Amino acid sequence: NVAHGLAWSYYIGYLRLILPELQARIRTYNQHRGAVSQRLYILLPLDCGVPDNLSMADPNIRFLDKLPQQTGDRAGIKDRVYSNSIYELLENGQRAGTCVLEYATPLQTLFAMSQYSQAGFSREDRLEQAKLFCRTLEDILADAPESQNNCRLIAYQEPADDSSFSLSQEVLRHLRQ
Amino acid sequence: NVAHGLAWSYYIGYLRLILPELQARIRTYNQHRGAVSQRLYILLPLDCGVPDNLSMADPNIRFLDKLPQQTGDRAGIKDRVYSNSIYELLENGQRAGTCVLEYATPLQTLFAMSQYSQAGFSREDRLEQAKLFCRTLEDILADAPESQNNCRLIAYQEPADDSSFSLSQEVLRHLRQ
Ligand SMILES: O=C(O)CCC(=O)c1cc(-c2c[nH]c3c(F)cccc23)cs1
Ligand SMILES: O=C(O)CCC(=O)c1cc(-c2c[nH]c3c(F)cccc23)cs1
């Protein structure tokens, strides 16, 4: 299935390469008002909507700073640059958590494939494939050596057509545990 | 199939985002001994072997310089950095071409999946899936609006067990046309 390959490729081509150096980069930031959490938090919206600006998805998610960059030679790209962003999570006007946060970009591919006739991916299959992506990635990371309390997947389905939804509260549930 | 999804994800998640700005970045480099070619050259080894150092794959492929970086907000990563590398191609001691060059990183995922028992991808399926990746990507890019004489795929199979192979000569065949 499409989602199976995408989950494996996201581990192999991205997470396996950034997760081993992540806690070092975070420790460095914290040492040079509240330490940044030690894990990469990955947003997995099951509606596969991936905005590029996180603060427009919820005003209580506020960009704070960039992590120091990681670079490595990758596939002929000399000093390929991996950048990641740190966010503050607010709750009733209070800073309640700080963490490295981003969306899983493969879900934006599921979204786009579903709109392109030539991709052979029907619009109505997005949700099932997003669920399959989330399950496959969780199963990969549970057994992966580069994941050492390094990463937390935050999967969520914003309520059917309508009701109240808070992305920042979804992240905070995981941060608190 | 695995390769179908990976080809679509490589277009959607990478090429669609860097190709529109590529000729601008190249024009800038050329203006601020022989101009860099106007296209991104993508190496598609059908054996799915993707080294991170290109000059160790062939001594006639020599790193020259980095393209100026492109940055954009991407999935919550503020100023996500896209770096690309420029190479000189030599032939009998002469510089015969200059171009932005890198490997298609999805082929390294096909290679890795084929070695991981949990990925359900048999070792003997690599070649067929690499061929399918190459065909799917060519068909995507042929109809893609962001590809305007912007990109050239270089697919090759290094001779069965043994005979002479020159990666630099493979790239030069395409550069010359
Ligand atoms: O996506 C960004 O730009 C920030 C994260 C990053 O640098 C990378 C992501 C992947 C990747 C592996 N598989 C993918 C897929 F199936 C769809 C989209 C992206 C990817 C390789 S590197
Ligand atoms: O791979 C690098 O780090 C340099 C190029 C780059 O930045 C990106 C690549 C992709 C990607 C989309 N699909 C992929 C897949 F299936 C396997 C591996 C990578 C990718 C997203 S961004």
Beta-carbon contacts of A157 under 8 Å, excluding residues fewer than 6 positions away, are A45, A46, A47, A127
Resolution reading in Å: 1.8
B52:A109 CB<8 A: no
DSSP H helix total and E strand total for chain A: 5, 7
How many angstroms separate the CA atoms of A112 and A101, rounded?
22
The amino acid at residue A140 is I
Domain hosting B10: range is 2-176
Token couple for B29: 């480099």
Which residue's CA lies nearest to atom 1 of ligand 1? A105
How many angstroms separate the CA atoms of B85 and B62, rounded?
10
- Cβ of A109 less than 6 Å from ligand 1: yes
Residue A82 β-bridge partners: A70
The string over A63-87, giving b where at least 16 C-beta atoms fall within 10 Å of a residue's C-beta and e elsewhere, is: beeebeebeeebbbbbebbbbbbbb
Q: How many residues does chain A have?
A: 177
How many CB atoms are closer than 10 A to CB B129?
25
- The kind and range of the H/E element at B30 are helix B16-31
Which single residue is written with the structure tokens 């100026």? B68
How many angstroms separate the CA atoms of B114 and B124, rounded?
8
Backbone angles phi and psi of A150, in degrees to 5 = -115, -15
> Domain of A143: which CATH number?
3.40.50.12100
Which single residue is written with the structure tokens 């030069």? B172
CA angle A46/B20/B61 to nearest 5° reads 105
Which single residue is written with the structure tokens 């997005």? A126
Q: What is the DSSP pairing of strand B70-74 with strand A77-82?
A: unpaired
Beta-carbon contacts of A107 under 8 Å, excluding residues fewer than 6 positions away, are A44, A45, A48, A50, A130, A133
Interface test with A, best of B4, B6, B9 (most A CBs within 10 A): B9
B14, B144 contact by CB (below 8 A):
no
Token couple for A35: 């330490």
CA A170 / ligand 2 centre spacing (Å)? 28
B66:A80 CB<8 A: no
Interface test with B, best of A74, A107, A121 (most B CBs within 10 A): A74
CA dist A99 to A20, B19, B73, B74, Å? 17, 32, 18, 17
Which single residue is written with the structure tokens 């030690």? A38
The string over A103-123, giving b where at least 16 C-beta atoms fall within 10 Å of a residue's C-beta and e elsewhere, is: bbbbbbbbbbbbeeeebebee
In order, the DSSP letters of A10-26 are HIIIIIHHHHHHHHHHH
Count of domains forming chain A: 1
- Chain A hits for B170, CB-CB cut-off 8 Å, are none
Residue B171 β-bridge partners: none
The one-character DSSP state at A125 is G
The amino acid at residue A33 is R
CA B10 / ligand 2 centre spacing (Å)? 6
Looking at chain B, which residue has its C-alpha nearest residue A4?
B2
Token couple for A151: 């990463």
How many CB atoms are closer than 10 A to CB B16?
17
Handedness of CA B63, B69, B72, B76 (dihedral sign): positive
Q: Give the three-class secondary structure for A91.
A: strand
Backbone angles phi and psi of B17, in degrees to 5 = -90, -30
- Chain A hits for B43, CB-CB cut-off 8 Å, are 76
Beta-carbon contacts of B32 under 8 Å, excluding residues fewer than 6 positions away, are none
CA dist B115 to A63, A90, B3, B118, B126, Å? 39, 44, 16, 9, 10
Farthest-apart Cα atoms in chain B, separation = 51
Residue B61 β-bridge partners: B89
Token couple for B106: 């999805």
Q: What is the DSSP pairing of strand A61-66 with strand B40-45?
A: unpaired
A8:B113 CB<8 A: yes
A132, A139 contact by CB (below 8 A):
no
CA angle B5/B13/B55 to nearest 5° reads 95
- Chain B hits for A118, CB-CB cut-off 8 Å, are 139-140, 143
Crossing angle of helices B2-10 and A106-115, rounded to 10°: 100
The one-character DSSP state at A67 is P
B105:A75 CB<8 A: yes
B78:A66 CB<8 A: yes
Q: Give the three-class secondary structure for A117.
A: helix
